[PDB]
Amino acid sequence: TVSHEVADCSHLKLTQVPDDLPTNITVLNLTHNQLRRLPAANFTRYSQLTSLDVGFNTISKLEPELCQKLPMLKVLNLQHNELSQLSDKTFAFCTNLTELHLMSNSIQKIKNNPFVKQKNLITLDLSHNGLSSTKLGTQVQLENLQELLLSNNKIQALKSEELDIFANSSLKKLELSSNQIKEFSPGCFHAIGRLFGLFLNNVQLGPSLTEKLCLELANTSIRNLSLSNSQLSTTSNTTFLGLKWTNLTMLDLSYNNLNVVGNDSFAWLPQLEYFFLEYNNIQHLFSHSLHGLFNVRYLNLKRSFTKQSISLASLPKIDDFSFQWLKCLEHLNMEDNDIPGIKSNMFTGLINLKYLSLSNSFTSLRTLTNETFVSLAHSPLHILNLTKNKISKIESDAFSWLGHLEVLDLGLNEIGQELTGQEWRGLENIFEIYLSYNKYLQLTRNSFALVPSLQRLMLRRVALKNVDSSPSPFQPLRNLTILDLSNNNIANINKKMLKGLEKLEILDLQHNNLARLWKHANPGGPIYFLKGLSHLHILNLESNGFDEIPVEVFKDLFELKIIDLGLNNLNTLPASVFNNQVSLKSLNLQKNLITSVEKKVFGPAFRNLTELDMRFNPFDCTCESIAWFVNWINETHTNIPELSSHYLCNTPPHYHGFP
Amino acid sequence: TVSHEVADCSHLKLTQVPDDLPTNITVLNLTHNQLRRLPAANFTRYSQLTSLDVGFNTISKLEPELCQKLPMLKVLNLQHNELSQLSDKTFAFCTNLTELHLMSNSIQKIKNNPFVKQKNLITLDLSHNGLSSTKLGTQVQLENLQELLLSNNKIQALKSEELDIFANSSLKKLELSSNQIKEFSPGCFHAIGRLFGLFLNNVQLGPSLTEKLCLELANTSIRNLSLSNSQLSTTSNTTFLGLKWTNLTMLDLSYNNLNVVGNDSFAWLPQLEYFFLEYNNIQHLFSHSLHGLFNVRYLNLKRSFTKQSISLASLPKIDDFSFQWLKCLEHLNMEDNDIPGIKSNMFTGLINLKYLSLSNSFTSLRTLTNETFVSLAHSPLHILNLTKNKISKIESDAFSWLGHLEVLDLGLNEIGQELTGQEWRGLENIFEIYLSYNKYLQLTRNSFALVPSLQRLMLRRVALKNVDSSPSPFQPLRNLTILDLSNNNIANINKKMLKGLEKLEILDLQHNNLARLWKHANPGGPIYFLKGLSHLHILNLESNGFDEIPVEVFKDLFELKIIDLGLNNLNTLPASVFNNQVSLKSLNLQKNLITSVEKKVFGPAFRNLTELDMRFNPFDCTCESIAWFVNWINETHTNIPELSSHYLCNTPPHYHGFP
RNA sequence: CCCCCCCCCCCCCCCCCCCCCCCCCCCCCCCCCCCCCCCCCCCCCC
């Protein structure tokens, strides 16, 4: 049991408490053990404990003397025990506890008054118990109790007198999840002095019982009310009438299989700010369905509509001016839906929208016409997600109405076209554009001429074509910092492609075909496309098939810190190639054909590093090529993973396999 | 001008005849030179010449004294000269010549009698001349002349008196190709004593002029008659009436753009044995169209039918019982056609067929039903070709009627199915089966159980599946000698796949994935699937990705002569692996990772060879690994191509690039 | 004999990620052949 400040005995197969520990220990963890009983005679030495986790054990019963030896104990964790018997003296001397977790204790019934003797308890948990009533005592106690759990119990009814013991208690979290509760008594929730949160998740209520609960919850200080997986199939206008007299701010209806949402149902929630309806089966949405929610600031509709069926083609249709009431909506999630498309008035009325997500939200939004996003003209949208919508074509002025757009994601689509440059018109504040994993893209001389403020440009695995045009397509991108052109099988690159991009920091060119551009036999000479990038930090050149590196390629990367050259065919490197890399930190040369590591080339590179990866290289165990390398390895501070497992010699055969 | 027995001066830019040659030279070749004139005063030394080729020169005129110095001259080759003037004395002293080629001499008119003085001439050529008449003299000469060319001339008519000089001459080949001849005179061909062959290729005759020619050719000893590219658009029953009185055996109508073949047209050729109709545009074939050809032994119909057109879908249709008259047909070529398919009576009546080719002959023969080849039941067919017919499915008993089939070719198709084994039923005499370049094949335990006599089996690039069944699919193939399983990406092979195939000689397994089966870390041990093949001769294992070879793999290949292991990842080979290869002749190890060549492993292999290919290997210039190799290279007889260009050292760097 | 609670260990299935090897298709470049066209120089014939 290793212990420097806290003691851990997780999965150590301990049966009895250890007797050799420092006296000043604060936390004693004995989880996942086989302690049948816990005598208090062995806790004389341990008198400074604050947290005592004895969960996941076979403890049957305890004794009052246990708390005598722990006067400063604050956490008494008894998760998943066999403690099914409680008495007044069980927690008598214990009064400074701030947590008492008793989950899966198989407690049947609270007998008289076990929790009276403590008053500073903050959190109490009784989940996975056999309790059938919520009574926890006779008189009033647990004044400072903030949260209480009763989930996974056998409670069938809630009586007012059962919770009368909390007449002066502020319950910030009252869990009643997974309870077979079907009856509500008048004034049951009014017994609690300060009620802030309810969680009736996985409780089969139904519209009638939900309406009764809403009526019973009227005129209280409730703040959060979650009804997840409540089997709330249908909603009526009077279902949430009782919530009018409250100040509810967060509501949840997730996984309720809500077949139809009623008309003007949520008119009684003027103070609602957070709304959750994900994973539902709404078939039709009415214009006045969302009436009265003019204060919500967060709406979640992930998979909130019914999925398409070939039997009837029942596509969930959203009526026009549906969101005209959500004036204060600022975050809208609508992923994993099957909406037929965007109409001329689908998003009208959203005057505060800031984040709209439509990932996999449409059955087939193949063409982005200039009138597709007309409804978002008055929405100051900043981040728009359109991934996995099977978009195949983008027309001119597609995003003309999104003047405030900053982040645009069009990846994971089938966008196949040529960027004429007018597709991005109207994006005066765009910063990041994602176009990776498309069908095919064809760049022109003015593909990005209308987005001079762009900073990120991801074009990974998009089959780039005509990137070697005489005018560089990235010339207008003066503020570009991150550029990704990987997995495009790029073959020809002009030497002026990256000219003028002094602010470029991360450049990815892995999984391309640029071997010919660096060979000295290339007609016209080697292509030096890595000149002037004084601010380059991360350079990735994996799987480019390079056979030789010209001497003056890295002559300008003074601020380079991470350089990747793995999976190439490098065999020999010219001397004085890493002198300019005075701030290098990580070097990657795995799976190459390097045989000699000399201080002529790797000297300045290995001046001071943090990572080094040259694992799968056929090194040569010779005094003129490996002596300096092993001498540097002997005394250094750089981290070399798998140094003795993969840095192996191949030649000569006398030293074949020798590290 | 190198010369050991004959003299060659081809493209040597010679202007005058050389004067330093052996006297006993027999052949003097001066082709492609710039000899303006050929004086006979320089031929005093050369008196033993037999063949004198002065073709492709600028010779203008000759003198009779030239033949005086060459009494034993037999070939006087004067191809492509400016000799446009002839006289009686030009070929006076020349009498022992057996060949006189005068093509492209720009001869306008034969004046009086230039060919009288010789009588032993055999071959005479006058192609590409400006002759307008066939007169070659006044009296009769050239008694022993066997062939004569008049192609590419300016002849417009053929008169009987023009060829009267051959009253006692046997012309075995009379070329009149590319002649604008439009008039035929009576008795023109009867002047020649023995006429055996005519070649009117590329002569625009037409049906009427063709009929006139046939009438004029009646009652002669003609044997071959070719009318290739004669613009014979249409044929009538009376077109070839005149050929009845002859004994014609070979006829040609190739490239005639024959739109329609007449009914009962060829009834006048009872002795025809060879028939050519390739590259025609026949649209409809009648049942009685081929009547009277009961003696033809070779029919060619390559692209003899019109191609399909989307405008009208005019697929060339063949009437039933079309070939019922060709009783003696033994070789039928019908490639590059667009026949809709095979009917129930397409090939009925062919009782002597031995070779049927249907490569790219059908528009879409997708399914080979059991009734597809019903017409071939009575044909003793031996070789059948069905390549490039886009066959996609084969049913049971497809080849049940082909009991005499020996070679079957089904490659270059889209055959995708699983071989249940009944597809080959009825092939009791099959020897070779070609199935390469199909869509996908799935083998079972009894895929080839009905073909025990098979000897060749090509399955190259067919995407073989389930080849690793517990019963080897090749078990019934006891007589199998050549097996091809390359380019199938085979991954798993059982050790008993080739058990019982002692007669296997050529085995191909290149472009597969068998690296795991030979690694010593493979669960269950390495797979020794090359045991018992004592008669194996050619072994091909290219691009299998092998990393190590178990010692006892080649312990049984005593008769192995050619072994291929290139394009693999071999780095080191265990000692005593090539001892059993006592009859090895060719070793291939190119593009591997071999670094050391030691006599422990390569000793017995290099005992006596003819070829060695270890070019693109990273050798190691060390006294313990390359000294024996270079010593063996210094004194040996094996052919090592590109020894000084690609056998280069890579390590140590002091000897980097040194051969 | 029954219903539950753990700790340890051994298997089965599914999903995700990564590595090795290989095939097919396509892209970039180079080389070797065949055909056609153009241009330049020189030598002849009518």
Author numbering:
A (entry chain A), B (entry chain B): 29 to 687
From the reporting publication:
Toll-like Receptor 3 (TLR3) plays a key role in anti-viral defenses by inducing a potent immune response against double-stranded RNAs (dsRNAs) produced by viral infection. The ligand-binding site involves both the N and C-terminal parts of the TLR3 ectodomain.
The closest contact area between the dimeric TLR3 units is composed of the negatively charged N-terminal and the positively charged C-terminal residues of the neighboring ectoTLR3 dimers. To test their role in TLR3 clustering, we made two charge-reversion mutations. The N-terminal mutant, NT-mut had a triple mutation of K117D, K139D and K145D and the C-terminal mutant, CT-mut had a triple mutation of D523K, D524K and E527K of ectoTLR3. The micrographs of the resulting complexes show that the clustering of ectoTLR3 is significantly reduced or entirely blocked by the mutations. The dimeric structure of the mutant ectoTLR3 is still superimposable with that of the wild-type ectoTLR3.
